[PDB]
Prior knowledge:
Largest sheet: none
Shape: elongated
Strand content: under 5%
CATH class: Mainly Alpha
Order of helices and strands: HHH
Number of helices: 3
Helix content: 55-70%
Structural class: mainly alpha
Radius of gyration: 18 Å
Amino acid sequence: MKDPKTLLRVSIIGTTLVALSSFTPVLVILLGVVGLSALTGYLDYVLLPALAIFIGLTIYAIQRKRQADASSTPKFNGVKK
Length: 81
């Protein structure tokens, strides 16, 4: 009887935004790595640490692909804060 239509609507709206802000931030790490490489001059590796990212990210979609229906985090899985 509560009919939490708009109540549930706020999660998708706020819940859709995490992934948007959480997907771009990776690109920043590479430049910093390169920046830090100036110190250790290991920027040569970059190609390798990037393999980890492609392996890590490509895998991540798939986890979201099965959950894609779920979209938001499972109701059972949550924290106090």
